[PDB]
Each structure stands twice: as C-alpha cells, then as structure tokens.
Amino acid sequence: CHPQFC
Amino acid sequence: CHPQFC
Amino acid sequence: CHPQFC
Amino acid sequence: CHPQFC
Amino acid sequence: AEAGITGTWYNQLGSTFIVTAGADGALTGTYESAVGNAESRYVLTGRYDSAPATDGSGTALGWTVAWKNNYRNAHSATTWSGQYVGGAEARINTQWLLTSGTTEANAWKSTLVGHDTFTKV
Amino acid sequence: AEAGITGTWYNQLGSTFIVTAGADGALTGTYESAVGNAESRYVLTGRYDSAPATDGSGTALGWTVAWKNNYRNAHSATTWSGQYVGGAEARINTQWLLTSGTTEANAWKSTLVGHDTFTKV
Amino acid sequence: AEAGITGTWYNQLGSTFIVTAGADGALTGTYESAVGNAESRYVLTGRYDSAPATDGSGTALGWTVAWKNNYRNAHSATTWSGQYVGGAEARINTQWLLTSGTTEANAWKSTLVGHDTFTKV
Amino acid sequence: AEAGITGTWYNQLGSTFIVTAGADGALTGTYESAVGNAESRYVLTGRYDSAPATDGSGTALGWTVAWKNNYRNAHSATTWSGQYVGGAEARINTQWLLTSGTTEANAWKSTLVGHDTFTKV
C-alpha cells in the first residue's frame, strides 16, 4: 500500500 | 472538435 | 510553438 | 519480469 | 468477462462502443461519437487477457480506433488500456492515449492523455 | 505507410514485432519478447490512419497485445499509441500504457506508462 | 484562482491537501493520506499559471510530493498536472505520474499513471 | 543525489534546467527554453526522495514549471516525474504532463504527455 493512498 | 468527442 | 520547446 | 520485457 | 464484455458500453459523454469478445482474446466492434449519426462510427479492434480469477480482479484489455471512415479522416488514432469489472454494475475503467500525425518538429504536441469509464447504462 | 509499415520492427531492448498493414487500416501481427524463444510470441492487432500527406507528417497508429499465449498468462495488456515516419531511417515512435487486472483496492497501481521507438534495424 | 485555490481540497479516496497559492505563482502546502494520522503528512510544492480569463478557462497548475517524512520513506515521488475551475463547485482535475526509484533493469516498471479530482467538500 | 543533482542539465532539444537540491528534499531552480534568450527562463520547484541505496536504484523526483514570466504567459504548466541516476554519465529520465487551461468543453484536449532525458553534457 503506498502513502499516496494509505 | 475531434471524432472521439463529437 | 510553446515555451517548453522554443 | 514481464513478457513485454523478457 | 468475454460474454460479460460483449455488448454496448457508454461513457460519460455519450460515446457508445459495441464489442464482441471472441473465445481467443479478440475484441472487435465499432465506436460511435456524440450526435449518433449514421457515421460518426469507426472500427475498433483490441485484445483482452482472460484468466483472467479467485480474488475478484478485473480483466485487462485494450483496443484501438484509427479516426478514419467514409466521412472523416482526423489523421489520428486512440488506444484505450484498462480493465473490465463485471457484476451488478459492470464497468470498464480506462486511460487513453490519442496520437495525431505531426511533422517531426511538432511531435511534442502529438499525444494527449485522458481517461474514460464505460458502463452498460 | 501501409507497405512501409509492413515488416519487422525492433525496439531498443530487443523486442521484435512483425506486422502486416492491410489496405483498409488494419494492423495484424505478433510481438516477441527478449530471449526470442518459440513462444515469448503474442498476437497483436491494431489500426492505422492512412491519408495519412503533403507536409511530411507521420501516420498515426496503435495496437494492443494481451499477454496470454500457451506458455504464459500475465493478466495484463499493453496498448502502444504513436506514429510511423518512413524514409531512410523509418521508425515508429510510441508511448504505451500497460494495465494489469487488479482488485478494486489496487486499481491505483494498475497502469504503467512508458515509451518505445522501433526501427527496421 | 489564487485566493480560490488556497484552502483544503479532498479527492474521492479521502486524501486531503492543504495549499496556499502565493501572489507570484507559488503553491506550498501539505498532502495527507487516508487514516489522517499525525504523519501520513508530506510537503508539497508546485506552481500555477495565473492570467489565467474572459472565456471561463481553468487555471493550469501542478505540484510534486516526494513520499518521505519522519515515519515513512517510500522512495518515490508523484507529480499532479491539471487545472483549477472555480465557482459554486470548484474543483481541480488532474492526471498524475508516480515514479519509484528502480535499478536500470526495472526502469520499465517505474512510473504509474492515474487521475484525481479534488473538491472543497 | 542532492550534490549530484545540483547543477545544469540539458535535454535532447537544447532546453537547460539549473537546480539546487536542498538538504531536506527541496528542488529549486529555473528552466530555459531554446534560443537561450534572457527570458525564455521560468521558475521551477519540485521535490526529490533521498534514501534514496545498497542496490543502485535511482532517486525519485519531480518538479513543476508554470509557463508564465515577464515576456510570456502560455496559460499552461508542465510537471516532470522521473529518477536521477548518478555516475560517469548521470542522467535524469522523466515522463511529463503538460496541461493547458481550457474551457470545460475542451478539457479532453488539455493534457499532452511525453518524455525527456537530461544529461550534464
């Protein structure tokens, strides 16, 4: 999961 | 205007 | 022509 | 590696 | 997918696309622009990857439309790349690339990028 | 174009693509990955816009390859959008979109974008 | 624009972005991911083109966020390119490119492309 | 990176970009178009993700340039997303999005996509 999303 | 649109 | 190019 | 590449 | 893909799809602007997904990955059909006149209809051809699924993934696909028919020649082609999701409200989410033929000097302005979502309604 | 497009094309990584451009805008052929083994070969289908020209413009085209054959099923498809430029050193300059089927949660990571240039040499 | 851009914006996933548009084209602020914890907050910097208008055009802008802060280092950066439309329901429509650092062999998988729409609500 | 990024970079068309990578991820500088006249110079701002590395990965970065200065206002902005690779022949490989402000009807033609590679030579 990437910071842009979570 | 282009065929993809109109 | 656009500044990015010329 | 994906078929597009290898 | 396949049966699920076959049919009529509409995007948020009114464009309609009609496709037949064949047994072995082929996608054939026609794309019609707004107005919906006899020939704002262009041929489309593409492919889809069937396996496609024990975890609810979408089915990857893509197609191309060259904007030339018997009434118009827009010297351009568009490719849509995305996936099909079936279900109550099946849809095809895509990103597209529209390239116009240019001279080598204008090649920087040859490709536009956008996205489209198609539904059965 | 057309005759000029028909043939074998290579990109900077070694991938090869073989196409036949038909009279009425069709593009059919196969794409082969690196290694060049019997079947790193996938079917490709696309379209090109012929008019295409009194000012040296390129010919717009696009094609799709679903990454599934009898040895591999990568649950993805790639579309290439670009133009063909003929001449001493003819080439096809493209931008591509590679979409993988994902679950709705991972849809953000479903499409990669890149570019490729193909030559006859 | 400018005053109109300054404020809090939300996209369809819950991410929030807070920006100050300065007199001379600067855009500074922070981007916060979902969960909304003290630090899923990253610095953002960008520019906007003011003239911007006697025909209702949008204001072109873009910003970048490097995904590194005191709790996370995702070795990637995202750039959003789009335009701001003001009014009753002002919004910013964008297309984004997310690049991750890779080795030269994996460079083909380094950039993902997508789109986002931000609203004040 | 950082020190390695700081300096003058050139792309294949002659455009030049001058940047200072600051300790904490900031990228500030100016972009100059071809001709190289006093002011075909525009301000650029961006960010880079430092960790960046025990396996030779590139450093992810991105920046934006709004095409407005004291001689030109092109009502557009470009964002470059890519990575920096250092070494004998260091380079920055990027993909860019150029968005122009349009009316809502023309939004489909608002974003062009391309790529650029910058070198120190």
Domain coordinates of chain G in residue numbers?
A: 1-121
Say which residues have a Cβ less than 8 Å from residue C3's Cβ, sequence separation at least 6: H33, H40, H42, H67, H72, H74
Give the DSSP H/E element, type plus range, for residue G107. Answer: none
Read off the DSSP letter of residue F57: P
Name which of H67, H61, H60 is nearest H43 in CA terms: H67
Distance between CA F25 and CA F45 in Å, rounded?
11
Asked whether the CA dihedral H31, F115, E19, F107 is positive or negative, the reply is: negative
H116 to chain F: closest CA residue: F115
Burial of F24 (0-12, 13-18, 19+ CB in 10 A): exposed
Distance between CA E66 and CA F2 in Å, rounded?
14
CB-CB contact of G40 with G33 (8 Å): yes
Most A CBs within 10 A among F103, F104, F108, hence the mutation to make, goes to F108
CA distance H67 to chain C (A): 7
Name which of E8, E6, E83, E85 is nearest E49 in CA terms: E83
Distance between CA H58 and CA G2 in Å, rounded?
35
Q: How far is CA G22 from the centre of its chain?
A: 16
Three-state SS for G33?
Answer: coil
Nearest CB among G68, G83, G95 relative to H49 is that of: G68
The secondary structure of H91-110 as a DSSP string is EEEEEEEEEE---GGGGGGS
E31: annotated binding-site residue? yes
Three-state SS for F75?
Answer: strand
Q: Which two tokens stand for residue H17?
A: 């970009």
Q: F7 phi and psi, to 5 degrees?
A: 135, -165
Distance between CA G59 and CA G47 in Å, rounded?
11
Asked whether the CA dihedral F61, F66, F72, F74 is positive or negative, the reply is: positive
Q: E35 phi and psi, to 5 degrees?
A: 100, -60
> Which phi-psi region, left, alpha or beta, contains residue F94 (left: φ > 0; alpha: ψ -120 to 50)?
beta
Q: Which two tokens stand for residue G33?
A: 């991911």
Distance between CA E53 and CA E96 in Å, rounded?
25
Asked whether the CA dihedral H95, G109, E65, F10 is positive or negative, the reply is: positive
Distance between CA A4 and CA G16 in Å, rounded?
10
CA distance H69 to chain F (A): 31
Q: Which two tokens stand for residue H50?
A: 């430092």
Distance between CA G21 and CA G33 in Å, rounded?
21
Instruction: Find residues 78-117 of chain H whose CB sits inside 8 Å of chain B.
Output: 108-109
Q: Which two tokens stand for residue H72?
A: 């030109």
Cβ contacts below 8 Å, chain A against chain F, sum to 4
Buried b (16+ CB within 10 A) or exposed e, G79-118: bbbbbbbbeeebbbbbbbbbbbbbeeeebbbbbbbbbbeb
F98 to chain D: closest CA residue: D4
Give the DSSP H/E element, type plus range, for residue F81. Answer: strand F73-85
Three-state SS for E94?
Answer: strand
CB-CB contact of G39 with G70 (8 Å): yes
F71: annotated binding-site residue? no
Identity of the amino acid at F2: E
Three-state SS for G100?
Answer: strand
Identity of the amino acid at E69: N
CB-CB contact of H91 with H119 (8 Å): yes
Breaks in chain G (C–N beyond 2.5 Å) sit after: 52
Q: E104 phi and psi, to 5 degrees?
A: -60, -30
- Measured from the Cβ of residue C4, the count of other Cβ atoms closer than 10 Å reads 24
Q: Which two tokens stand for residue H10?
A: 């050139």
A1 to chain F: closest CA residue: F106
F42: annotated binding-site residue? yes
Name which of F8, F14, F4, F2 is nearest F116 in CA terms: F14
Asked whether the CA dihedral E24, E116, E114, E56 is positive or negative, the reply is: negative
Distance, first Cα to last Cα, chain C: 6
> Which phi-psi region, left, alpha or beta, contains residue H25 (left: φ > 0; alpha: ψ -120 to 50)?
left
What resolution in angstroms, rounded to 1 decimal? 1.5
Distance between CA E88 and CA H52 in Å, rounded?
45
Cα angle E19-E24-E27, degrees, rounded to a multiple of 5 = 20
Name which of H73, H92, H69, H71 is nearest H82 in CA terms: H92
Residue H96 with chain E: CB contacts under 8 Å: none
Instruction: Find residues 1-6 of chain A whose CB sits inside 8 Å of chain F.
Output: 2, 4-5
**Which residues face G6 on adjacent strands?**
none
Residue H78 with chain G: CB contacts under 8 Å: 62, 81
Architecture of the structural domain at G1-121: Beta Barrel (2.40)
Q: Are strands E59-68 and F16-21 parallel, antiparallel or unpaired?
A: unpaired
Q: Tell me the CB-side half-sphere exposure of residue E102, using CA atoms within 13 A.
A: 15
Name which of E75, H91, G111 is nearest F96 in CA terms: G111
Distance, first Cα to last Cα, chain F: 17
Residue F98 with chain D: CB contacts under 8 Å: 2, 4
Q: Name the residue with tokens 């099946």.
A: E90
